[PDB]
Nucleic acid binder design. Structure first.
Ligand SMILES: [Mg+2]
Ligand SMILES: [Mg+2]
Ligand SMILES: [Mg+2]
Ligand SMILES: [Mg+2]
Ligand SMILES: [Mg+2]
Ligand SMILES: [Mg+2]
Ligand SMILES: [Mg+2]
Ligand SMILES: [Mg+2]
Ligand SMILES: [Mg+2]
Ligand SMILES: [Mg+2]
Ligand SMILES: [Mg+2]
Ligand SMILES: [Mg+2]
Ligand SMILES: [Mg+2]
Ligand SMILES: [Mg+2]
Ligand SMILES: [Mg+2]
Ligand SMILES: [Mg+2]
Ligand SMILES: [Mg+2]
Ligand SMILES: [Mg+2]
Lengths: 207, 147, 203, 102
RNA sequence: UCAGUAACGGCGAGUGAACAGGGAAGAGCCCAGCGCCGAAUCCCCGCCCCGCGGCGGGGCGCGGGAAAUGUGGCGUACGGA
RNA sequence: AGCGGCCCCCGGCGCGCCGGGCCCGGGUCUUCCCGGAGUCGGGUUGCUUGGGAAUGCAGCCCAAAGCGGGUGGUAAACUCC
């Protein structure tokens, strides 16, 4: 029974809603549970990284977001065949591997291989038996200086190049931008008819 | 604040502020928006015109990302780059020009609204508009596209 | 060797050979009872592609199921209610006849745990099947390290809770745009996540 | 004049080079093998043909292909599966015509 | 969070999703088929020794049973031998 | 109240041996092999979902294929990715 001037609106409460009501009084006693099951997890593995193995650099889809770089699932198998690492050792040294990724470009393949070459030079590798190394193990020096790394390892940061102030050419004053955007729209709509009427003239000119 | 309401000031009056002839019963005029076309016709024909009917084309699996295009004017185009670059640009006698990026600052299309102060610029964007292109061509400076 | 093309024989179902072997086996099966044990599977091809290793422990039954829909068990007509809900004849059942056959042969022998089922023959009014049952506590199943997952008490009655491949179709799940309405656990909690009010503390 | 990578048009998009890597193995499912053709034609040599095609051969002996197309499209499915079935029975019709002509 | 939105509906009353983005948690795998190794396979009964309040290991059994209508090993779509 | 004391019990996990088990990995090149069948899909009737020339499920008849098959939100053919 609406009065003079109020907005129309449709509330979704014709159902029985009082039976299924999710309260949130748990919340300040579940942030403490997760804090304990995370710090007792951080003391089980004493020198390992707390934040999971390192994770690749990947762009994002959907033209709204295609100018960012964020974390991924795991490395591909081209970023490991080139970097010379076997695909089941990398699972055992803390390197995320997913076999479901393509590489259609090249300029992210290279920056991943370079990031692996950074981590391989930061990695302190303990000996199996603390009495006998391998060819590639580390010395008894770094063991005394081995410690954890809180936070996401080598955090992924969005960098931008810069440019200084150039001098404007005499040419760019004569570049009409809008009659080129609306030419490419017209040329992108008339690609079939232009290529069909020429065929119909090639069927008509035999006469 | 039970103590500031109205019903705490009505304990003593019989009807409690809803009359005696036609009492406050439960639902006189239907429940909700009943009678758009029969007997609440005047309220919708006087306050919500065009509540009734269909118009136009349907579009099924519609995303809100293919048509993402935030805008900007030429008034505050100088607000992206900090102050001391517009100064050094108005100060040097050489004839250089500071490059303004919009896509980096979260804008795509460049419209044109206001007056613009006279110093040469270079704009990298993804679209333009015809007034907003002839104001920069008229001041001096270019309009550069980018995919 | 043979198992590649017994496989390709058992898709000549219109041919004269399989139209003979079924125009015989369905008759032989029709004079038996509804649920009886055979000593060896009629199809070893299809039997091995589901997990039937030919050792001690695995059992194979054979049950018949009658055919058709399901008309509503009311008196004469008399389905009291609005005229939407009058329908008695042309109703159709949700789960298949294959997981009817599985749980008819899964309740009568309660000491066993169902693995999977397959097809054998068809009549006008009968559909026959085969089933595969596993002893949970026999020492050959027990000491295998791969497949001692059955004996765990979770997998009791896989067929009543709908976990066989014949009930996984009835549940309506997978991935994609085609399966929106089973996000979460199932179809129910895809309803429960939606039709509730999350009332925060501060709102 | 000058050219820019236009984000709308015919060849739109940011210009990034491209690599040629090995196509994924799963990209091949059962394309075919020589052992497979060896045995699928031996079983074809053992059992014959279905009784919806022992009428199609008999309507393709009178050089009707539109009628036997509406007759194998009514049964088997679409028009694509009807075509790859018909181009196959113009072959296992012509090998008898070839051997009887031999 | 998108969203009370694209859509349905005597298009009236009213019902009503997902993808992307930021976060909690983070773990992945095995068989059949194709093939090769002389059933290279299990379970139970027998005697002895050790331990046995979750019935197990090693030695012996011309002592018996199931499996060629297929038991084990390598091997599964990231290619493999 | 206190990293205060004492007396019992069961473990978690660290080290010595004494036992048995298992002899296995890379890289680079030549020759071989490689996949789930009354199901996919099509017509139809009925319930369903926001899904609209029919999203899913179920029933009846018809019933496949290997440079093949399904999907690419308006039915239909010819096409390319
Ligand atoms: Mg009133
Ligand atoms: Mg008064
Ligand atoms: Mg009043
Ligand atoms: Mg009164
Ligand atoms: Mg009155
Ligand atoms: Mg009232
Ligand atoms: Mg009704
Ligand atoms: Mg399932
Ligand atoms: Mg809103
Ligand atoms: Mg009306
Ligand atoms: Mg998402
Ligand atoms: Mg975490
Ligand atoms: Mg194995
Ligand atoms: Mg095998
Ligand atoms: Mg409905
Ligand atoms: Mg079904
Ligand atoms: Mg469409
Ligand atoms: Mg197309």
């Amino acid at each position: 029974a609406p009065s003079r001037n109020g907005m129309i609106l449709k509330p979704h409460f014709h159902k029985d809603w009082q039976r299924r009501v999710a309260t949130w009084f748990n919340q300040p006693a579940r942030k403490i549970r997760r804090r304990k099951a995370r710090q007792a997890r951080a003391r089980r593995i004493a020198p390992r990284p707390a934040a999971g193995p390192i994770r690749p650099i990947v762009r994002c889809p959907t033209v709204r977001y295609h100018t960012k770089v964020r974390a991924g699932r795991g490395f591909s198998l081209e970023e490991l065949r080139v970097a010379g690492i076997h695909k089941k050792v990398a699972r055992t040294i803390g390197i995320s591997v997913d076999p479901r990724r393509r590489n259609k470009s090249t300029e992210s393949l290279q920056a991943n291989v370079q990031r692996l070459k950074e981590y391989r030079s930061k990695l302190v590798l303990f000996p199996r038996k603390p009495s006998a190394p391998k060819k590639g193990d580390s010395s008894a020096e770094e063991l005394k200086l081995a410690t954890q790394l809180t936070g996401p390892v080598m955090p992924i940061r969005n960098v931008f190049k810069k440019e200084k102030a150039r001098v404007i050419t005499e040419e760019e004053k004569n570049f009409k931008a809008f009659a080129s955007l609306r030419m490419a729209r017209a040329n992108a709509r008339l690609f079939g008819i232009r290529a069909k009427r020429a065929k119909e003239a090639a069927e008509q000119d035999v006469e | 604040p039970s103590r500031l309401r109205k019903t705490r000031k009505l304990r003593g009056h019989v009807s409690h502020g809803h009359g005696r002839i036609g009492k406050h019963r439960k639902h006189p005029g239907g429940r909700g928006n009943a009678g758009g076309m029969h007997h609440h016709r005047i309220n919708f024909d006087k306050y919500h015109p065009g509540y009734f009917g269909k118009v136009g084309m349907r579009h099924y699996h519609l995303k809100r990302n293919q048509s993402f295009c935030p805008t900007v004017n030429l008034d505050k185009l100088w607000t992206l780059v900090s102050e001391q670059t517009r100064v050094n640009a108005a100060k040097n006698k050489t004839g250089a020009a500071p490059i303004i990026d919009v896509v980096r600052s979260g804008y795509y299309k460049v419209l044109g609204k206001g007056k613009l102060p006279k110093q040469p610029v270079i704009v990298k964007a993804k679209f333009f508009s015809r007034r907003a292109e002839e104001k920069i061509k008229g001041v001096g400076g270019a309009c550069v596209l980018v995919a | 060797g043979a198992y590649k093309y017994i496989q390709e024989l058992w898709r000549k179902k219109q041919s004269d050979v399989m139209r003979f072997l079924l125009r015989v086996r369905c008759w032989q099966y029709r004079q038996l009872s509804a649920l009886h044990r055979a000593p060896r599977p009629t199809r070893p091809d299809k039997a091995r592609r589901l997990g039937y290793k030919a050792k001690q422990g695995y059992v194979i039954y054979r049950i018949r199921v009658r055919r058709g829909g399901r008309k509503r068990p009311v008196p004469k007509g008399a389905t009291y209610g609005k005229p939407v809900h009058h329908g008695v004849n042309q109703l159709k059942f949700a789960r298949s006849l294959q997981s009817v056959a599985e749980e008819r042969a899964g309740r009568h022998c309660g000491a066993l745990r169902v693995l999977n089922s397959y097809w054998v023959g068809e009549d006008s009014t009968y559909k026959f099947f085969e089933v595969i049952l596993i002893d949970p506590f026999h020492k050959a199943i027990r000491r295998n390290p791969d497949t001692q997952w059955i004996t765990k008490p979770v997998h009791k009655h896989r067929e009543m809770r709908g976990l066989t491949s014949a009930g996984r179709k009835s549940r309506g799940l997978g991935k994609g745009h085609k399966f929106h309405h089973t996000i979460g656990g199932s179809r129910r909690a895809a309803w429960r996540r939606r039709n509730t009010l999350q009332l925060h503390r501060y709102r | 004049a000058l050219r820019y990578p236009m984000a709308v048009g015919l060849n739109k998009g940011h210009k990034v080079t491209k690599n040629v890597s090995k196509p994924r193995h799963s990209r091949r499912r059962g394309r075919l093998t020589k052992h497979t053709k060896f045995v699928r034609d031996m079983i074809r040599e053992v059992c014959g043909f279905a009784p919806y095609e022992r009428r199609a051969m008999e309507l393709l002996k009178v050089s009707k292909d539109k009628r036997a197309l509406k007759f194998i499209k009514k049964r088997v499915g679409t028009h694509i599966r009807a075509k790859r079935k018909r181009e196959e029975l113009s072959s296992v019709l012509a090998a008898m015509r070839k051997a009887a002509a031999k």
